[PDB]
Design an enzyme around this catalytic site. Structure first.
Site, mmCIF file in Angstrom:
data_model
loop_
_atom_site.group_PDB
_atom_site.id
_atom_site.type_symbol
_atom_site.label_atom_id
_atom_site.label_comp_id
_atom_site.label_asym_id
_atom_site.label_seq_id
_atom_site.Cartn_x
_atom_site.Cartn_y
_atom_site.Cartn_z
ATOM 1 N N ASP B 137 0.834 -1.201 0.000
ATOM 2 C CA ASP B 137 0.000 0.000 0.000
ATOM 3 C C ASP B 137 0.868 1.250 0.000
ATOM 4 O OD1 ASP B 137 -2.501 1.158 -0.277
ATOM 5 O OD2 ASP B 137 -2.906 1.284 1.871
ATOM 6 N N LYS B 139 1.882 4.494 -1.167
ATOM 7 C CA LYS B 139 1.288 5.610 -1.891
ATOM 8 C C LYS B 139 1.476 6.878 -1.072
ATOM 9 C CE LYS B 139 -3.236 4.605 0.104
ATOM 10 N NZ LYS B 139 -4.705 4.695 -0.068
ATOM 11 N N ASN B 142 0.390 7.438 2.494
ATOM 12 C CA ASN B 142 1.022 6.569 3.476
ATOM 13 C C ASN B 142 2.493 6.909 3.712
ATOM 14 O OD1 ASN B 142 -1.315 5.168 4.033
ATOM 15 N ND2 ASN B 142 -0.907 3.574 2.508
ATOM 16 N N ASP B 159 0.485 2.555 7.783
ATOM 17 C CA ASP B 159 -0.631 1.825 7.189
ATOM 18 C C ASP B 159 -0.242 0.437 6.688
ATOM 19 O OD1 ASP B 159 -3.157 1.241 6.348
ATOM 20 O OD2 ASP B 159 -3.404 3.058 5.132
ATOM 21 N N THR B 178 -4.787 1.126 -4.323
ATOM 22 C CA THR B 178 -5.252 2.227 -5.146
ATOM 23 C C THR B 178 -4.748 2.054 -6.574
ATOM 24 O OG1 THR B 178 -5.207 3.689 -3.208
ATOM 25 C CG2 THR B 178 -5.312 4.740 -5.382
HETATM 26 N N1 LIG Z 1 0.761 7.356 13.645
HETATM 27 C C1 LIG Z 1 0.018 8.434 13.303
HETATM 28 N N2 LIG Z 1 0.254 9.652 13.833
HETATM 29 C C2 LIG Z 1 -0.484 10.728 13.491
HETATM 30 N N3 LIG Z 1 -1.503 10.692 12.616
HETATM 31 C C3 LIG Z 1 -1.845 9.531 12.008
HETATM 32 C C4 LIG Z 1 -1.084 8.314 12.323
HETATM 33 N N4 LIG Z 1 -1.618 7.321 11.594
HETATM 34 C C5 LIG Z 1 -2.636 7.848 10.876
HETATM 35 N N5 LIG Z 1 -2.772 9.163 11.126
HETATM 36 C C6 LIG Z 1 -3.775 10.043 10.492
HETATM 37 O O1 LIG Z 1 -4.846 9.224 10.018
HETATM 38 C C7 LIG Z 1 -4.892 9.249 8.589
HETATM 39 C C8 LIG Z 1 -5.192 7.867 8.024
HETATM 40 O O2 LIG Z 1 -4.277 6.890 8.518
HETATM 41 P P1 LIG Z 1 -4.142 5.501 7.718
HETATM 42 O O3 LIG Z 1 -3.822 5.858 6.289
HETATM 43 O O4 LIG Z 1 -3.197 4.583 8.452
HETATM 44 O O5 LIG Z 1 -5.627 4.892 7.822
HETATM 45 P P2 LIG Z 1 -6.657 4.868 6.585
HETATM 46 O O6 LIG Z 1 -5.915 4.885 5.275
HETATM 47 O O7 LIG Z 1 -7.684 5.943 6.839
HETATM 48 O O8 LIG Z 1 -7.365 3.437 6.791
HETATM 49 P P3 LIG Z 1 -6.842 2.093 6.069
HETATM 50 O O9 LIG Z 1 -5.977 1.447 7.129
HETATM 51 O O10 LIG Z 1 -8.112 1.338 5.755
HETATM 52 O O11 LIG Z 1 -6.095 2.550 4.838
HETATM 53 C C9 LIG Z 1 -3.542 9.771 8.130
HETATM 54 O O12 LIG Z 1 -3.651 10.542 6.933
HETATM 55 C C10 LIG Z 1 -3.084 10.636 9.281
HETATM 56 O O13 LIG Z 1 -3.519 11.985 9.087
#
Ligand SMILES: Nc1ncnc2c1ncn2[C@@H]1O[C@H](COP(=O)(O)OP(=O)(O)OP(=O)(O)O)[C@@H](O)[C@H]1O
Ligand SMILES: Nc1ncnc2c1ncn2[C@@H]1O[C@H](COP(=O)(O)OP(=O)(O)OP(=O)(O)O)[C@@H](O)[C@H]1O
Ligand SMILES: [Ca+2]
Lengths: 300, 299
Positions: B137, B139, B142, B159, B178
């Site tokens: 994943d 991208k 991430n 992620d 994606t």
């Molecule tokens: N460790 C972290 N610290 C700060 N902010 C975070 C962190 N992890 C995620 N975020 C916030 O949450 C958003 C989404 O995180 P993540 O991409 O891991 O989950 P997702 O893509 O929404 O769900 P999926 O796991 O189904 O892809 C990020 O864009 C970020 O802004």
């Protein structure tokens, strides 16, 4: 174009939410000038090419162009189209009877004769689409609704033409979409697509309707997709002990990988389980029962 | 190994930091220590047929992977709680936002600085690939930054929902990711391995240098067709300032056959990343990347 560039709320009283999807939100509405009720499908327009939000205009245009062609008692109808900065609003025939499965899961008893009649309504609508070389590509339980659920034998309406596509000969069409549980092998394998995928999906829906069980559904999506491409399924006696060999034969000829060997919509309409050629076949079907117990379990 | 305890007994749950289809991330602070983390709540799938939440086995597998990884360019797992509905991943807090958002506001940018960030990504991916872990994943969204407020931000890869441990002689196939960033083997539903990550790196680099995307079509269908046909170009409109070595780097990543594609070690060894002489370094130092198109695409 054709999309009315006006405020839809100037012409419709917007009501309560019917349902929602990825990029659309659907609501009840009443046209001020007629007092007639419809369903308004607000499709969010995609703002940039590299966005996973909304829908690009060309595809919306494609959905409309297809909807405008379709007039059949088992298919939803298109009334009008509006558009502002953000959304394209499809004014559709309102279907108020909910989903078919939820209605069946409500049922006390249900024979294969009754079952096949609902299935024939579906076949009738799909037959009309395939005739016009239209592939639905999104045939699944939730897109199978009822006009009025408060009558003894409700009428079926196929909805949701977001993935619908007109099949042109010589013009190869491939794309990745749909719910894994219901997609054909040629979709999973990213191979040439056509009218046959609809037929596979019908096989799956029928399998579930009769047993409550799903033919290829695994513990995970990886498994489901693997199951689909291996055409790995069985008629578990646990669920299929009362199902007729004709029904099983009907299902068998649908769940076939080679697209050319798969039953067409006309062959499905002419299958003995759907259209008995004699008294005997009719009685058998009349004597077979659907597994309402397992069905209720899975869809509750 | 999931603590069957209320996260909120051990953490102060703060503001929402982000959200996706399956999870919601919130800032949190451990009571015993007063240290801050990011609490990622993942809704557990309740039925095999449901399209909501995530299968518990899959969540267990992600955690199994996270527990193994310790590296400055990879997010770090601190703890895992679980209740009725959610599995809560307590993760290293990352406060610098997404790399691209930061680039999109940068004044100037050379290829030297670009390879600096790309290098961090390669370091993080290399560590993963050594342990046979494919990210799957990779991208922009991430690719996060630890700090944001420093001369050269630190990259953290996040992620791991699609992450998978590649077993020798155990075919793995699945549909995910994606479209803009997926490899041909994913689109084609063919055997998957560590190579997909490398293809994604190429796409990300292509975007970083030009603001343009190599396979992105007007529709997903076209994008998929572009990918499987490996049909892209270096449009002079966007690649006029791009160094030859950079394009060679990308060219060797965007390759259909998984055996021809650069491995992560070969990527780390490419002269665009690791110059062999003064001459090569200068060309990269004088190679300016026009941010104009990039900003148009990512603001
Ligand atoms: N460790 C972290 N610290 C700060 N902010 C975070 C962190 N992890 C995620 N975020 C916030 O949450 C958003 C989404 O995180 P993540 O991409 O891991 O989950 P997702 O893509 O929404 O769900 P999926 O796991 O189904 O892809 C990020 O864009 C970020 O802004
Ligand atoms: N004519 C209608 N009457 C009542 N409800 C409808 C109607 N059309 C759609 N719906 C509601 O919306 C859903 C149909 O999907 P819809 O047509 O909104 O597709 P979409 O949201 O554009 O894409 P998808 O739903 O496939 O992600 C159904 O579950 C139903 O609840
Ligand atoms: Ca294939």
């Amino acid at each position: 174009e054709t999309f009315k560039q006006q405020k839809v709320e100037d012409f419709y009283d917007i009501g309560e939410e019917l349902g929602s999807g990825q990029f659309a939100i659907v609501k009840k509405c009443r046209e001020k000038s007629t007092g007639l009720e419809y369903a308004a499908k607000f499709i969010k327009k995609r703002q940039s090419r590299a966005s996973r939000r909304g829908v690009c205009r060309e595809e919306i245009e494609r959905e409309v162009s297809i909807l405008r062609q379709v007039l059949h008692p088992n298919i939803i109808t298109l009334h009008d189209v509006y558009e502002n900065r953000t959304d394209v609003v499809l004014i559709l025939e309102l279907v108020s009877g909910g989903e078919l499965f939820d209605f069946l899961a409500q049922k006390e008893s249900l024979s294969e004769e009754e079952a096949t009649s609902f299935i024939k309504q579906i076949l009738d609508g799909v037959n009309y689409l395939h005739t016009k070389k239209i592939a639905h590509f999104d045939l699944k339980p939730e897109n199978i609704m009822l006009l009025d659920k408060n009558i003894p034998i409700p009428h079926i309406k196929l909805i949701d033409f977001g993935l619908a596509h007109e099949i042109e000969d010589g013009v190869e069409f491939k794309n990745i979409f749909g719910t894994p549980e219901f997609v054909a092998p040629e979709i999973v394998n990213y191979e040439p697509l056509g009218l046959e995928a609809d037929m596979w999906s019908i096989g799956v829906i029928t399998y579930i309707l009769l047993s409550g069980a799903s033919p290829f559904l695994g513990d995970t999506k990886q498994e489901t997709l693997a199951n689909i491409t291996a055409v790995s399924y069985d008629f578990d006696e646990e669920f299929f002990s009362q199902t007729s060999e004709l029904a099983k034969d009907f299902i068998r000829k649908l769940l076939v990988k080679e697209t050319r060997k798969r039953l067409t919509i006309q062959e499905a309409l002419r299958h003995p389980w759907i259209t008995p050629v004699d008294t005997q076949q009719a009685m058998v079907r009349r004597e077979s029962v659907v597994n309402l117990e397992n069905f209720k379990k899975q869809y509750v």
